[PDB]
Design a protein around this ligand. Sequence first.
Ligand code: HEM
Length: 153
Amino acid sequence: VLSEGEWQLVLHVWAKVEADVAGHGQDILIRLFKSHPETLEKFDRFKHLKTEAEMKASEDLKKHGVTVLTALGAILKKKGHHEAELKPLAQSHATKHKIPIKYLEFISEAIIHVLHSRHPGDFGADAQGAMNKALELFRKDIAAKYKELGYQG
Ligand code: HEM
């Protein structure tokens, strides 16, 4: 459970992300795909992309980055009270998209790295630890739904 002070650190940096949702979404998905190429293979929509320049030039990838970060921002702003938001996301990601929890760990690393690059003054160690806790809570709660449905592993 995050404290109020931890949530304030999380949402303070997230308010900075929302100034350029699309650029953050690009940087995060590209980092994910470069650092963990198995993740790109899960996207029929993107797996034709073979270089970082092609990824950066894809408007559709930019659009999807906004989709992803909008969903995450709505979860973070619930401060843990996010059951309604996680139900459909866990269902689609477990049963339709077939995304292991481990890949949610990978995107969480990518998010933290990009926030550190873009917002160092609002993403010191205290905020890094708080965002790591928020993303762990996200994964814990999604993992419980995966387990219900027979997909935790
Ligand atoms: C912060 C974590 C993530 C969030 C908030 C998120 C959010 C979303 C949302 C809102 C959608 C569209 C609605 C839906 O299908 O549920 C979507 C689609 C999808 N996501 Fe995620 N996602 C996350 C992580 C991942 C990861 C790590 C992968 C793959 C490694 C992945 C793969 C997919 C795929 C394949 C689709 C469908 C894309 C398409 O063909 O249109 N997601 N995601």
